[PDB]
Structures are given as structure tokens and as C-alpha cells.
Design a binder for this molecule. Sequence first.
Ligand SMILES: *[C@@H]1O[C@H](CO)[C@@H](O[C@@H]2O[C@H](CO)[C@@H](O)[C@H](O)[C@H]2NC(C)=O)[C@H](O)[C@H]1NC(C)=O
Ligand SMILES: *[C@@H]1O[C@H](CO)[C@@H](O[C@@H]2O[C@H](CO)[C@@H](O)[C@H](O)[C@H]2NC(C)=O)[C@H](O)[C@H]1NC(C)=O
Ligand SMILES: *[C@@H]1O[C@H](CO)[C@@H](O)[C@H](O)[C@H]1NC(C)=O
Ligand SMILES: *[C@@H]1O[C@H](CO)[C@@H](O)[C@H](O)[C@H]1NC(C)=O
Ligand SMILES: *[C@@H]1O[C@H](CO)[C@@H](O)[C@H](O)[C@H]1NC(C)=O
Ligand SMILES: *[C@@H]1O[C@H](CO)[C@@H](O)[C@H](O)[C@H]1NC(C)=O
Lengths: 323, 316, 152
Amino acid sequence: CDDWGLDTMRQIQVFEDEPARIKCPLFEHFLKFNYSTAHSAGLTLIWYWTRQDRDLEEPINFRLPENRISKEKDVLWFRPTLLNDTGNYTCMLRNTTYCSKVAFPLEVVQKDSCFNSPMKLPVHKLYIEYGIQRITCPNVDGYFPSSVKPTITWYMGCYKIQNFNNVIPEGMNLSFLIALISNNGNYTCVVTYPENGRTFHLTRTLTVKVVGSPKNAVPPVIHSPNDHVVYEKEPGEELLIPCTVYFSFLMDSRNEVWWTIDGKKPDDITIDVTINESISHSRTEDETRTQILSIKKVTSEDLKRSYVCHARSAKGEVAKAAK
Amino acid sequence: CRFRGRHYKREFRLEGEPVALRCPQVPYWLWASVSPRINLTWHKNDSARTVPGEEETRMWAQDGALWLLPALQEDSGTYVCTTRNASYCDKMSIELRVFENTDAFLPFISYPQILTLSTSGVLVCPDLSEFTRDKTDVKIQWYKDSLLLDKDNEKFLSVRGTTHLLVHDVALEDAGYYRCVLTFAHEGQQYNITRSIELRIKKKKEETIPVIISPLKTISASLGSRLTIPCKVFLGTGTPLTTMLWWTANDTHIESAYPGGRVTEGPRQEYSENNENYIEVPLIFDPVTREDLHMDFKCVVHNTLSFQTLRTTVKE
Amino acid sequence: APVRSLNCTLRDSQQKSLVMSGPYELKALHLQGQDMEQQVVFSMSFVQGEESNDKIPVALGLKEKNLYLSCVLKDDKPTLQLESVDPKNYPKKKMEKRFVFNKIEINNKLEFESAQFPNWYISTSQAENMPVFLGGTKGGQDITDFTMQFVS
Ligand SMILES: *[C@@H]1O[C@H](CO)[C@@H](O[C@@H]2O[C@H](CO)[C@@H](O)[C@H](O)[C@H]2NC(C)=O)[C@H](O)[C@H]1NC(C)=O
Ligand SMILES: *[C@@H]1O[C@H](CO)[C@@H](O[C@@H]2O[C@H](CO)[C@@H](O)[C@H](O)[C@H]2NC(C)=O)[C@H](O)[C@H]1NC(C)=O
Ligand SMILES: *[C@@H]1O[C@H](CO)[C@@H](O)[C@H](O)[C@H]1NC(C)=O
Ligand SMILES: *[C@@H]1O[C@H](CO)[C@@H](O)[C@H](O)[C@H]1NC(C)=O
Ligand SMILES: *[C@@H]1O[C@H](CO)[C@@H](O)[C@H](O)[C@H]1NC(C)=O
Ligand SMILES: *[C@@H]1O[C@H](CO)[C@@H](O)[C@H](O)[C@H]1NC(C)=O
């Protein structure tokens, strides 16, 4: 059987005592296009697990009794999951010709009433002082019918959200009216819902992080090659040259700084030289990179030869040094 | 009994709408100490006999405050609260002025609300506390110069069930007068409670990263005991605001550590100099001597946009 | 010169002004047009208690007056209070750290953390007349950051 090792570093983490809804990995054996998954070929989807142990086992699911692990449609469904569920899981596809299995370690996580947990939280960038933004409860999708109306409360810390000065619960969404630095912190929504005469919980938490507006996303500003501070150095003074540069914040921003001897990654001829590279970030995540040059004796040619600091990030910039 | 003082916020309300004068600084609705309550009654400066009772059926006294719905023009006046612990007694006055409900009187009722431009900001409808003790969360309707703002409007968002009006991105044309309008519900009576907001725009403030301009290792020296020193910073544009020229050897702090009086730095100089430019300068002076003959010295310039520093070589 | 101070008036996130009424207390409420210059004006001066690009240590007290606000534990919980001072000595650098704050200013909106008690901020309720106070919760029900306008 075509078999892929478990997604070791691509791991799943789930809260105890409340419904999970796990999907079988089809990013391997991709198999999804023009109407999703094809069961038409008659490739039966088999599930089975092993636990933190040494043996595989058929998965009981019907008399659990409450179909507590029933897989309704090409995917697994725990209502509700339980700590004993921790372990490695396997799904495979069968055609008289076809086979393919894969595993993924399911770690069940206990939950504090203050929402403390080993669970990794998603960082959620939020632009500063924007007019109004908001966040939706992460993974509620598909857990319950459109017919039922859920109760759902939010919490900053263990601090429930009510009468907040600039945050407002609006059903599934949390709205931040003028996102200020004050707004950083882990947030957590907790959605409840009835099913077959029972209330299931769904608690999920993500950490909001306020960052710089795109309103001020601007080409890098060169500070050091200002020319008001003139770099002159008589023969052999161990001269140094710092290039501090401010970067506005953007997400897909690759901030780059590099010195230009004249267009070729220094070290032409002898010209011994090396870079020190410092860095700093505003509370807002505004990078400010810096570079410097330790130097030996200054050869006669250096002074009248020009070299320049550079930087670019979705925009490009340049500044001329002076000796 | 003593007269404690006049209540700072006078209240210029409009005619034909509710009013609530809460005894000044006496209560805060903090009614923890209220079992066998304290004696309390109001009275006009000129009109004393009042219980304060009611001219018609208008006036009465709710928890710690008397109301005037509707408040009539002529109701203008000054009032004093009363409090009585046999062990104590005192009084305080709230001023009051009622205007006619003419558009012309608006500029006098206006609350100045400020917002810097090219940013989002919020206008809150003021003085509504006494009436916002109900759960039908604030049914307010913001008008702009007699223009009702609907969710269809993209410039201004009325926050659902709140006092805030969200200006999404404020512009110069956004300045002017606005209106909060709380529809009340007392005893089954539905009444409008208007509030005039007047918005002032402000330009975001300049703040540039400065450069330092006195980096030379002390080119001169000789032990004349007189030590001259400048730390010249270049402000691209005049902004000596949060800008700070703190001089410290590095660790010393130049004060309360390095001096028992031996060394300090006096006045400062905001030169302005060259027209467009603006510049500032400090002066650390060892007034009569420089003896230890060794020190790491560091010029610290610091504002909201940069913490910078500078050190210098041995000297002569 | 002693310390470069400066007069200004703070006003909070919900537009509320900052008027005195004690001097055992301060309050944050909406001032009508004709009552605006009731709002206290501040003498903010740089004490330089601890260096950081983020925090600028600043002590601020009321001008044409001798009051300066400071944090202290009223029964082991941070409390904002107005302590009077010798007009002779002040304003001064290296001021007692009860009297010191470090303003966190970002894009013209500024908070004031307590030096004595980190993670405790000058705050105000959303209610109207309730006093200004030292606060432990940031970004919650109480307003922590304000905006200042310089004055003359
Ligand atoms: C799921 O599989 C992982 C990996 O196969 C298991 O972790 C292994 O356990 C042994 C015994 O402790 C370790 O010595 C190995 O290093 C682990 N394997 C790897 C690749 O690190 C784990 O036992 C399984 N998860 C659960 C919950 O049983
Ligand atoms: C919000 O969540 C983050 C991440 O869960 C918390 O940061 C952790 O804090 C501990 C110290 O108690 C660090 O040792 C961890 O390294 C942090 N986690 C990671 C991976 O970043 C943070 O404590 C939460 N914020 C608040 C204010 O409670
Ligand atoms: C869960 O694990 C414990 C410990 O091994 C076991 O005794 C118990 O039977 C399990 N719970 C259930 C519901 O079977
Ligand atoms: C079984 O599945 C494979 C995968 O698509 C396919 O190539 C093969 O034709 C199938 N065998 C049949 C037709 O049953
Ligand atoms: C008023 O009198 C009561 C009863 O003796 C006393 O408890 C209270 O302290 C007095 N008021 C004040 C503020 O002292
Ligand atoms: C309240 O205000 C609206 C809009 O100006 C007006 O149409 C209405 O007459 C007012 N309500 C009352 C009770 O007068």
C-alpha cells in the first residue's frame, strides 16, 4: 500500500470534553477538483487508530454508544472528544488496485476555565487605529446546522468581554473600534449549541496583535547617510560607517539592507572588511535595521571612491555616503 | 450648616426636554451608605419655599437628583443640595440655563469634541448617564446639520446601541456641529434628549529623527579647568517638543552621582538659526575644574521616535 | 534650568475632559462649551527614571498649583493620590519614584505606566463623574490611553 509517514511536525491539537471534527489529509494524494472528492471509483475510506501504544485497532464507532466517533461524510466526527482519544490515527483508500494510508498524532488537550492550555494559539495581526476591524470565531464551521441558533461569549483574559471601551461582541465576530496597543492579548470565543437534547461546547482562542496601518506603509527611510554628519577620515583611522534604516510595516515585507562598494558584494581586491548587523522593532512591529563597517588602514583610493547604503521593501531606496 | 462650594459643570440644556441635577459631589450613585437615608432637599436661590415640589407636575426627586421634564425656559436658575448627618451638614449649587429650542441657540449647548485628521476617531454623546439606566441599549440617532446618518452612510458609523459615532477617516469637511438624540421612556412618556456636539480637527504633529553634530573627539584641551561643550542636534523642521537633550557620561547621569556640585549642565539653546531649520544645544560644564582626567562621556538625545547616543575619544 | 517641563491638557479616549474637585480627587467628565477652561492644566516634566525608546519617564503635576500625583498602596492595592510638595524644591529631576510615570506614546495617543508599580496605569471609567485612578487592567472596561493638547 502507498503509505506516507505521519505528519509529525504538522500536528493536531484538540480540547477535551468538546466536539472535534478531523479531516483526512488530501493535500497528499491531492484528489480534489471539479466537485471535491471522488468516491465514485468505489475507493472505500477506511479509518483506524493505535493510541500511544504498539498496535493498530479497528475503530469502534456505532455503539460508542452515541455515535461518539461516527464519521458522517469522508471525515471523522467526535461528539464529544475525550482525553482517552490521544494517539496516532490512520486513514486509507481502497480500490482493488488502490491503497494509500497516512497517520497524524492527535493530542487531546485539557482546558482551564480561565482558558489556560498547552494549545498553540494563532497570532492575528490587526492594523492600528483603523476605523473598525473584527475577528470571527476560528473553527465553528460545519459543527452544527443553520437551523440552530448558538449562544457565544468572548473573553480577553479570564476577563469576560462586556462594556469594553473599544471592543464589542457581535455574534460570531469581535469588533475592535480603534485598535490600540492596549488591545494586545490572547482572546477567546466560547460557542455553545444544543444537539439531540444536549449542549456541546466549542472554545477556541487566538492572540490579537496590533501592528502598523497600511495607511502608513511607505518606502524605507535612510537615516545614517544624511550628509549632515560628514564621514571624513584621514589615512588609516580605523573608520566605521553605520547605516541605520527605518522600515514601515507590511506583512509580505522582505526588508533588505546591503552596502554597495560599487555593485559587487564588497571584498574587491584586498579591501578587508566585515559587517556588524543590528536590529530593532517598534511596539508596532516597525523594523529598523542597521549595518556597520570595521576597517583597517585607509588606502589612498578609498576616499575619492564612492559607496552607498541600500534598502528595499515593496519599495526601493538609496543614500550617498561622504568622505 | 456649611456651604461647600459651586458645582463646576453648569448645565445649558434646551427647553422642552428632561433635565437631572444630581446633588454636586454629594452622591455618585454610590448608595452603599443609604440605609436610613440622609435628609435631602433642593431649593432655588431666589425661590426658597420649594420642597422643591413642582410648579406644575414637572419637578420631582429621583435617587439623588431632581428632574424637569419637560424643562421650561425660565427654569433657568441656581440650586443647592442639602445633606444632614446630625454629626454633619452642608450644601452645594448646580447652575442651570434653559434655552429655546431654536437652531440658533445650538452653539451655546455645544460640547467641543476633538479629532486629529486623516485618522479615525469617535464622537461620544455626553451627559446621558442618568437616563441610560435601562437595557434597550441607547437608541440614539446622529444628525449632521439636519442630515440623518444611516448605515448606508460610509463616512460615519453609528455604533449599535452606544453613544459613539465612528468617523472612519476624518477630513477637513467633517468639522462642524452634530447631534446626539436619545429617545427617552419614562412612565410611558417618549421624549427626545438632544446634545450638540461640535467637532474640531487637528493636524497630526511633526516629529522627525534628529542627527547629532558634535562627534569630534575633543580636539582641544590643556587643563585650563574651563570645559566647553556642545551637543548639536539637527531637527529637519522645528519640533523641540518631546525632544530631550540628556547628557550622561554613560553611567554617571551627570547629576546626583558625578556631582556634589563639581559638574553639571545649565541652560539650553533652541537656536532656530537657519530659517527653515531648527536646532537645540546643551552645555555640560565643569565650572572650575576637570581633574579626574578620565571619563566615558555620552550625549543622549531622546524623543518618541528615537533613542540615540554618542561617545568621544581621549582628547589632547 | 532644573527640568524642562511643559503645560498641557489631557483628555481621554471618549472625549472626556479632566477637571479637579478636591484636591483629594480628579474627575473625567464632559465639559459643555461654556465650561471648557475648567479642565486642569498639567505641568509635565521629564524626570528620566529609566531609559528606553518605548518608555519616556515623566513626572506631571498641576501648574499654578503645588500638586503632583503619585502612586501608593492604600491597603496593598495601587492607588492614585495627589501629594503636595515644597514649591521651593520642585520641579526637579530624579524625582521620588512615587511621583514618576513613563509615558508610552504612539501616534499621538499616550498611556502612562507607573514606575513604582509596572503594569499599573492612570485610568478612567467610562461613566462620567467617576474619578481618575491608578488601574491594573489595560484595554478593558476602563480607559487607559489619552491624548494631550499643549497649551499656553
Ligand atoms: C505517534 O507516533 C509517534 C512517532 O511514531 C510516537 O512517538 C514515538 O515514541 C517512541 C517511544 O516513546 C519514541 O522513542 C520515538 O522517538 C517516537 N517516534 C518518533 C518519530 O519520535 C508516539 O508514540 C505516537 N503518539 C502517541 C500519542 O502514541
Ligand atoms: C498570550 O498568549 C501568548 C502565547 O500563548 C503568551 O505568551 C507566552 O508567555 C509565556 C510566559 O508566561 C512565555 O514563556 C511563552 O513563551 C509565551 N508563549 C509563546 C509561544 O509565545 C502570553 O502570556 C499571553 N498574553 C498574556 C498577556 O497573557
Ligand atoms: C480512559 O483511560 C483510563 C486509564 O487507562 C481507563 O481506565 C478508562 O477505561 C478510559 N476511559 C474509558 C471511558 O474507557
Ligand atoms: C482504482 O483507483 C485508481 C486510482 O484512480 C485507478 O487508477 C484504477 O483504475 C482504479 N481501479 C478500478 C478501475 O477499479
Ligand atoms: C455621619 O454619622 C454617622 C452615624 O454616627 C457616622 O457613621 C458617619 O461616619 C458620619 N458621616 C461621616 C462621613 O463621618
Ligand atoms: C424627536 O426628534 C425627531 C427628529 O428631529 C422629531 O421628528 C420628533 O418630533 C421628536 N420627537 C418628539 C417627541 O417631539
